Design a protein around this ligand. Structure first.
Ligand code: AGS
Ligand code: AGS
Ligand code: AGS
Ligand code: AGS
Lengths: 24, 684, 55, 198, 675, 66
C-alpha cells in the first residue's frame, strides 16, 4: 500500500492598471 | 452489508422518531416526488441559500413515507443517506475505496429501485479523495441511480453547471427562502419540540417577536434559522438564570462577611444577625429547592405527555384498537389537566424564577448578538437620554441646532420609531471652519460607546480620484487585495452599530456619491466581492465646509431658514441633487462669540489640569487671565483653533521652559498669574 | 405535469376525510363501551367502501 | 419602431411623479426596481452624452458601462425617468430624438440597445408656475394646450411632438395630503404595533 | 520517448504524400534555409496573420527535403513540429511542465544535431507560469536546437520585444500575403487533389470566380484558406447532391401509398397506375445507377492519373530514364483526354445534376456563409424606385457611382464628395438611406454626424479625436470609430455652415488623402465610402425661384451664395452641389401616399383591410404640410391624426379584422367605417 | 452557518487595569520583583496612548513583563 503524497500547488494573482486624463 | 456499514437510514430515525417535525414546505416535497418519478433528468437536486432545511425536506419526505402520506409507488421504499466519511477511513490498501464503492454500487443495483439515495454536498460525490465522480457518474449517466441532490447555489454555479455532461440528469429544484409566517408556524411546532430540552415554557408573542426582530435586524442569517436559534439561545438564557439565583449570592456574601467579622472579633450582636440571615438563606434556599422540584415534576410529566403522543403515533402506524382509545382518552386529558395544574401552581409559586420566555428575553439576546440596543429600556438609558442632551452640551458648547438634530435622531432610533428602509441618522453637516464638527462626531462616539475614537473615520480627503472607491469598498475578484476586503465592509459587517464618519466629503471625487446614493436610499451596498452590507443600524454623518464665506458673511441679520436654503442652493451647485434630498437634514453651523470661547477655555484648561496631574502639578488660574486668553484666542474668521494655539503658546511655553529648569517643585499649586501682557507662573 | 397527474392518480382526498372520520368515531365508540355511532360508523364505512371500490 | 414610453409629465414637485413611475413599473413591469432614475439637471454641461451614454475613455462611467444606455444594457425591461428637461443641452434633445425615432441608440462603445421594451418619461417645471397658479377654476385640456405652447416656447416643437402625450400634474391640495399623511401615520402605527402600541 | 509523445514527423507524412504540394513562396523558403544554416542564432520566426499558411511553408520546405533540394547541411535531417499547449496543459503542480520540457531537450540532444524543430504560437511560450523561454535559452543560444517560429505581427510587438533572449535567440523572416493570380495557380495545383477526394470535377472559371468573390464578399478570412473552404464546402455539397434522389423519393412514396390503397381495395385502375409509376421509378433508378457508375469510372481514372503523377515524381527523384518519357508522353495526355471525354459524358448524362461545381454553388456557400454592374446601369431607376423627384441629383450621383466603380479618377480620392442644400424634409436623408441601400447595402447602415453642434476647438477635438493623455481618448473621435467599424458606409454631415471653419481643414484632408490621422495614431481610410455634406443655405432662394427656373443657372446662383459663405479651397474640392428644390404639393402628397403604404403594411401586419377616400388623402396632405420644413411635419401630423382616433376606435371595440374599412372624411377629420 | 460568532471585544482602559492587577500578582510570583500601582496605571495609559499596533491587554503585559 502507498501514501497520499503531498503536492506543490502553484497559484497566481493579478493586477489592474489605471489611466488618468487631464482636464484642459 | 456495506449499506448497513456505510449508509444512514433516515427512515429509521423517522421510525425512531428522533427527527424534526418538518412543518410547511409541502409544495416542494410534492415537486420532489414529481421529479423522482420522471424518466429523464431523474435525480432531483435541491438549490437554495444554506440554512433552509434541505436535509430537513428530505427527512420530511421520510416522514411522509413512514406516515404513508406519499403515493403508493413510493410506499415501502428506503432512504439511506450514505456517509462519505465512513467510506473514506478504513481504505488503507490500494483500491479499497474503489472496492467498497463498487460493492455499494452492486448492492444498490441489487436493491432495484427500492432504496432511494440522498447525498448532499454533491461536490463530495464529484470527488472523495477517479475516486467518486468517475465511479458513480456511470450510475448517474445510466439511470440506475435514483438519488437526490442538495446543495448551496455556489456549487450549483461552480461544480454543476460547468460539467454540462451532468445537465440532463438533474433539475433546478429551487427552494425559496421562506417567509415570516411559515417561520412562525415552524416555530410553533418547534416550540412544542424545544421545550423538552430546555425544560421551560415559551410565550407565543415572544415567538412572533423572535420572527419579527430576527428578520428585521440580522442579514447574514436567514429564515428560518435565525429565529430558531434565538429561541434556542434565549431558552438557554432562561435555563441559566433559573440555574442559579442572585439574592442567594447577596445574602451568602453577607453571611460569610459577618462570619469573618464575628470570627475576627473573638458587644457581639452578630451571632444574632448571622443567625437571622442564615435562617433567611436557608428559607430561600429550601424554597428554591421546592420550586426546582416543581420544575422537575412539571417537565417530567410534560415529557410523559410527549411520549404519549409518540406512542400513539406508533399505534396509528401499527393499528391497535383498544390501545389507541386507551392511550388517547385516558392518557391525554388527565396529563394535560394536571400539567395545567402544575402550570398554575407555578404561576402561584415561581417568585424569582420567571420561566416563561418573554419577548424582552429575545430582545436582550438579539442586542447582545448584534450590538444594537435591542434590549428594553433599563432606566439608565432614560437618564442616559437626559444625559444625551446634557452631555452633548458638555463636550460641545454652542451650536444648538445639530445638538437637537442628533438628539432627536437617536431618540427616534431608540423608541423604535426609526425607518427600517434607511440608516438611522443620515446627517450632513456644514458651516465655517474649526467649529466643533468632528468634535460633535467624537462627542457621539464618546457618548454611545464611551470611547472618543471608536468610530469609523473614513476620510473623504483621500478619495479625490476614481479608483478610491476600490480603496474603501473592496476589490473585484481575481485582483490584488481582493481577499482582504475593503475598509467600510469590514468595519460595518462586523459591528453594525457605529458612527460612520465621512470627513470633508466635498473633496472626494464625485463618483463616490454613487455609493452614497445606495447608502442613503437603501443601506445595503454592493461591495466588490459580490455581497451586501446592512447599514440600517448605523449613523452616517458627513462633514464639510462648503458655504464658508456665505455663513461667515450672513449669520447675523438673517434667519436660520433662508440661510439654510441659501447654503442648500450652494450644495445643489456642488453635489448631485439626487444625493441631497436623500438626507435627513442639512444643519448649518456658525462661528462663536466670546462666552463660547471662554467656556471652551474652561474645557481645555480642565483637560490641561488633567494632563499636569500626571506630571504632578496643579494649577488655579487667575480670572484676569481668562480675559487675556479671550482677547488672544479669538476671531470670527477662523473659529476655535486660535484659542488652542494661544493657550498652548502663552501658557505652555514658559510653563514647559520652567519645568525643564527643574525649578517648579511638585507639591505647590502653580497659580498662573499674569503680567500686564504675559502669564507668569509662581511657586508658593 | 405528467408525473403530477400521476400523483393525482395515486391520491384521493375524501378517502382520507372519511378514514379520519371513521377512525375518530371508532375511537369514540371504543371508549363508550346511547351510542348511535355504530350506525354512523356503518354508514360512513359503507360510503368509504363504495368510494374505495369506485377508485 | 417607436419605443413604448414617450412621456412629458408637467407639474410641481412632491406630486407622485416618482410614485407614478414606480406604479407603472409595479403593473406594467410588475416590480419595483424595473426603473433607472436619471435627472437631466446634471447634464447642463457639454459632456452629457459622454458620461450619460458612453464615450471615448479617460472617464469614469465607461468601466461601469455608463449612466443610461449601459444600464439599459443591464435592464432591458425598465422605465426611464428624465427629470429637469429644462436643464438641457443640444446633446440631450438629439439623443432623445434618436430614442423617439429608434429605440436602438448609438453609444460610445458601438452596441445599440433597443428601447422598445421600455418606457421613457420626462418631467419639467417650466409652465408648472402656471400649474401652481391657475389649476383652480380652469380646465385640464386648455391648460394642457397652453402649457404645451409654453413648452413650445421653451423647446423646439419638433422635439416635443414625437412624444405620445404631455400631461399635467396639479397641486395636491387637501385630501391627497390627508391620504398620504394617513399612509405615513398608518405605517407609523404598524411599527409601533411591532413595538406594541395603539 | 517524448518525440513519440509530442512531435509529428512531417517528413514521414509528405514521404507518404499526406501533405499539400505547396506552391510558390520560394524566396522566403530560401531565406529560411539561409537562417537554418547559420552558426548561431539558428532560429527563424515567421511573422504573418494566421491562415497565410506559414505551417504550409514549413510543410513545403519539408517536401523540398523529401525532394532533396537543400544545401549540404540539411540532407538527412528530420523536421518535427511541436505545440506549447501540449506542454502547458499538464501543469497541476510545480515542476511538471518542465520535466516534459527538459525531456524534450534530452531527446533533442539525443538525436545529436539531426532534428529541425518547429514550434508555432511563440507568443504563447512567453506565458506559462521562469516558465518556458529560459529553459530553452541555452539550446536556442548554443546552436543545439533549430527552432522555427510561427506567429502574428501584433503578438510579436506585444510579446517578443520583451525578453531579449526571446528576441535574438530568434530571427525575423517576413511572411507576406498571397496574391490573386498566385492563389489561382495554387488552386490549380490543388484542383486535382480536391477532384480526387470529392469524386467530382471542378469548373476552373468557377475557381477564379471563387477567388474573386472570396476577396469581394469576405473580409476576415484570407488566402489560401478561404478559397480552400469555399471549394471544399461546395464540392461536399455537390457530392451530397450526387450521392442521394428527390424524384425517386416522391415516386417511392407514391408507389407504396398506391400499393397500400390497392391492398385495401382487394374499378381497379391502380395496378395499371402502379405499374406505370414503378416503371418510371425503375427508369430513374437505372439512370441513377448509370450516373453513379460513370462517376465511379471517372474518379478511378482520375486517381490513376494522380498516381501516375506521383510515380513520375518518384522517377524524378530516383532517376529512371525510359520511365520518365513513357509515363509522361503516354499516360498524361491520353488519361487527360479521356477524362475530358468523361467530363463531356457526365455533362450529357447528369440530369436529375452536375459534378463540375459552378460559381452559383459558390454564391450559395458564400451568401449562406452577380448583377452589380447591370444594376448600376439601371441605378437611376433604382433610386426612383423609392424617392420621387429630384431627377438631376439622382443622375449626377449615378454618374459619380459609375465613375467610381468604373474607376477613372484618382483612387486615392474618396468616392462621394457632395454638398447638399435647400430646405429639408423632402427626403434628402431618405435619399441618403435609399442611396446607401441600393448602392451598397441598407438604409441606416451609415454614419450620421450632427455638425450643427461643433463650433469650437474642443468640438474639433471631439469629432477628430482627443490627443492622448486627455479627456476623450480610448475610443477615438466621434468620426473615427464610426468609420473604422464601418468599412463601407456613407458619411453624413448635417449643417456644415454651423461649424467653425477649421473642420473644413479636416474635410480637405479627407478629400485629398482619404486616410485621416486621428488622435489615436491610426489612419481610418475614407476611400471606400461616400462623404455627404448637407446644408440649407439657399433654401428660400430656391423656394422663391424654383418656378420655371432651370437647374444649372440656379445651381450657379446658389453656388455663388456658397462662395459668399464658404472657402474657395473648399468649393474647389466639391464634386457637385445639387439643388434639392422643393418638389411640389402632389409629389409630397405621393410621399405621404407611400407613408400610407407602409402604414397599411403595418395594418396588414395587424391584419386589417383598410381603405381610404382620396379626398381624405388630400386632407391628410393638407394637414401638416409646410414649405418651411418639408414633409416631416406632414409626416408626424398625419401619423398622429391617424394613430390616435383610429386605434382609439379599435380599442373602442369597433374595428373587426376582415371588414370593409373605408377611411371616410369627417368635416375636417377622418372616420373609419365597418362594412 | 455551522457556528455562532461570539464577538470578543477589545477590552477597555480600567478593565485592562484590573486584569493587570491579577496578573501583577502572577508576575510577582515569577520574576522575583515588586510591582507598583503607578506602574499599573502607567502601563494602561501608555499602551492605550502611544503604541497603535498591538492591543490591550496584550501590550500592557508586554510592558510589565519586559
Ligand atoms: N420546514 C422546516 N421545519 C422545521 N425546521 C426547519 C424547516 N426548515 C428548516 N428548519 C430548521 O433549519 C435547519 C436547517 O437544516 P439544514 O437542512 O442542514 O440546513 P439547510 O438550510 O438545508 O442547508 P445545509 O447546507 O444542509 S446547513 C433544520 O435542521 C431545522 O432546524
Ligand atoms: N461648542 C464647542 N465646545 C467645545 N469645543 C468646541 C466647540 N466648538 C468648537 N470647539 C473646538 O473646535 C475644534 C473643532 O475641531 P474640528 O471638529 O475639526 O473642527 P470643526 O469646527 O468641527 O470643523 P473642521 O473639520 O475643523 S473645518 C476643537 O478643538 C474643539 O475643542
Ligand atoms: N396625490 C398624491 N397622492 C399621494 N401621495 C402624494 C400625492 N401628492 C403628493 N404625494 C406625496 O408627497 C410626498 C412628496 O415626496 P415625493 O414623491 O418625492 O415628491 P413628488 O411625488 O415626487 O414630486 P417630485 O417629482 O418628487 S418634485 C410623497 O410622499 C408623495 O407620495
Ligand atoms: N504556397 C502555398 N501553396 C499552397 N497553399 C498555400 C500556400 N501557402 C499557404 N497556403 C494555404 O494556406 C492555408 C492556411 O492553412 P494554415 O497553414 O493553417 O495557415 P497558416 O498560414 O499556417 O496560419 P495558421 O496559424 O496555421 S491558421 C493552407 O491550408 C494552405 O493550403
Amino acid at each position: 500500500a502507498a501514501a497520499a503524497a503531498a503536492a506543490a500547488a502553484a497559484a497566481a494573482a493579478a493586477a489592474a492598471a489605471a489611466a488618468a486624463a487631464a482636464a484642459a | 452489508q456495506a449499506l448497513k456499514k456505510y449508509t444512514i437510514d433516515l427512515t429509521e430515525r423517522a421510525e425512531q422518531g428522533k427527527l424534526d417535525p418538518v412543518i410547511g414546505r409541502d409544495e416542494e416535497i410534492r415537486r420532489t416526488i414529481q421529479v423522482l418519478q420522471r424518466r429523464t433528468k431523474n435525480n432531483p437536486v435541491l438549490i437554495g441559500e444554506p440554512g433552509v432545511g434541505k436535509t430537513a425536506i428530505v427527512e420530511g419526505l421520510a416522514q411522509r413515507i413512514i406516515n404513508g402520506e406519499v403515493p403508493e409507488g413510493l410506499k415501502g421504499r428506503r432512504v439511506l443517506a450514505l456517509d462519505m466519511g465512513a467510506l473514506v477511513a478504513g481504505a488503507k490498501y490500494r483500491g479499497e475505496f474503489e472496492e467498497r464503492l463498487k460493492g455499494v454500487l452492486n448492492d444498490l443495483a441489487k436493491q432495484e429501485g427500492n432504496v432511494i439515495l440522498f447525498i448532499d454536498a454533491l461536490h463530495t460525490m464529484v470527488g472523495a479523495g477517479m475516486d467518486a465522480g468517475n465511479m458513480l457518474k456511470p450510475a448517474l449517466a445510466r439511470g440506475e441511480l435514483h438519488c437526490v441532490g442538495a446543495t448551496t447555489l455556489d456549487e450549483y454555479r461552480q461544480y454543476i453547471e460547468k460539467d454540462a455532461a451532468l445537465e440532463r440528469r438533474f433539475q433546478k429544484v429551487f427552494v425559496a427562502e421562506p417567509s415570516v409566517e411559515d417561520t412562525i408556524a415552524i416555530l410553533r411546532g418547534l416550540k412544542e419540540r424545544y421545550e423538552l430540552h430546555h425544560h421551560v415554557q415559551i410565550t407565543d408573542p415572544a415567538i412572533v417577536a423572535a420572527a419579527t426582530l430576527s428578520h428585521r435586524y440580522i442579514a447574514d442569517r436567514q429564515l428560518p434559522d435565525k429565529a430558531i436559534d434565538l429561541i434556542d439561545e434565549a431558552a438557554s438564557s432562561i435555563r441559566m438564570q433559573i440555574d442559579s439565583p442572585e439574592e442567594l449570592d447577596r445574602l451568602d456574601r453577607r453571611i460569610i462577611q459577618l462570619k469573618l467579622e464575628q470570627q475576627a472579633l473573638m458587644l457581639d450582636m452578630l451571632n444574632e444577625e448571622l443567625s437571622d440571615k442564615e435562617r433567611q438563606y436557608s428559607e430561600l434556599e429550601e424554597e428554591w429547592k421546592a420550586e426546582k422540584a416543581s420544575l422537575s415534576g412539571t417537565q417530567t410529566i410534560k415529557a410523559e405527555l410527549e411520549q404519549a403522543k409518540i406512542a400513539i403515533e406508533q399505534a396509528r402506524r401499527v393499528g391497535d384498537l383498544a390501545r389507541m382509545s386507551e392511550l388517547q382518552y385516558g392518557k391525554i386529558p388527565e396529563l394535560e389537566k394536571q400539567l395545567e395544574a402544575a402550570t398554575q401552581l407555578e404561576g402561584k409559586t415561581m417568585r424569582l424564577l420567571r420561566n416563561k420566555v418573554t419577548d424582552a428575553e429575545i430582545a436582550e439576546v438579539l442586542a447582545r448578538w448584534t450590538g444594537i440596543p435591542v434590549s428594553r429600556m433599563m432606566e439608565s438609558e432614560r437618564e442616559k437620554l437626559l444625559r444625551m442632551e446634557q452631555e452633548l452640551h458638555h463636550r460641545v458648547i454652542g451650536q444648538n441646532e445639530a445638538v437637537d438634530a442628533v438628539s432627536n435622531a437617536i431618540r427616534r432610533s431608540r423608541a423604535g420609531l426609526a425607518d427600517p428602509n434607511r440608516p438611522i441618522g443620515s446627517f450632513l453637516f456644514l458651516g465655517p471652519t474649526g467649529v466643533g464638527k468632528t468634535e460633535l462626531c467624537k462627542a457621539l462616539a464618546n457618548f454611545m460607546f464611551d470611547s472618543d475614537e471608536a468610530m469609523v473615520r473614513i476620510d473623504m480627503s483621500e478619495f479625490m480620484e476614481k479608483h478610491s472607491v476600490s480603496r474603501l469598498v473592496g476589490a473585484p475578484p481575481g485582483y490584488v487585495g481582493y481577499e482582504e476586503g475593503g475598509y467600510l465592509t469590514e468595519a460595518v459587517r462586523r459591528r453594525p452599530y457605529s458612527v460612520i464618519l465621512l470627513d470633508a466629503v466635498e473633496k472626494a471625487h464625485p463618483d463616490v456619491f454613487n455609493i452614497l446614493l445606495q447608502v442613503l436610499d437603501d443601506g445595503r451596498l454592493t461591495d466588490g466581492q459580490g455581497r451586501t452590507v446592512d447599514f440600517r443600524n448605523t449613523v452616517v454623518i458627513m462633514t464639510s465646509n462648503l458655504g464658508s464665506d456665505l455663513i461667515q458673511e450672513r449669520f447675523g441679520e438673517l434667519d436660520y431658514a433662508h440661510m439654510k436654503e441659501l447654503v442648500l442652493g450652494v450644495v445643489s451647485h456642488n453635489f448631485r441633487p439626487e444625493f441631497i434630498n436623500r438626507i435627513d437634514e442639512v444643519v448649518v453651523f456658525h462661528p462663536l462669540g466670546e462666552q463660547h470661547i471662554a467656556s471652551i477655555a474652561q474645557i481645555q484648561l480642565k483637560r490641561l489640569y488633567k494632563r499636569l496631574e500626571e506630571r504632578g502639578y496643579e494649577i488655579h488660574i487667575s480670572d484676569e487671565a481668562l480675559k487675556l486668553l479671550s482677547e488672544n484666542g479669538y476671531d470670527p474668521v477662523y473659529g476655535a483653533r486660535p484659542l488652542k494655539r494661544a493657550i498652548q503658546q502663552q501658557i505652555e511655553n514658559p510653563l514647559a521652559q520652567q519645568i525643564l529648569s527643574g525649578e517648579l517643585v511638585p507639591g505647590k499649586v502653580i497659580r498662573l498669574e499674569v503680567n500686564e501682557d504675559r502669564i507668569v507662573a509662581v511657586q508658593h
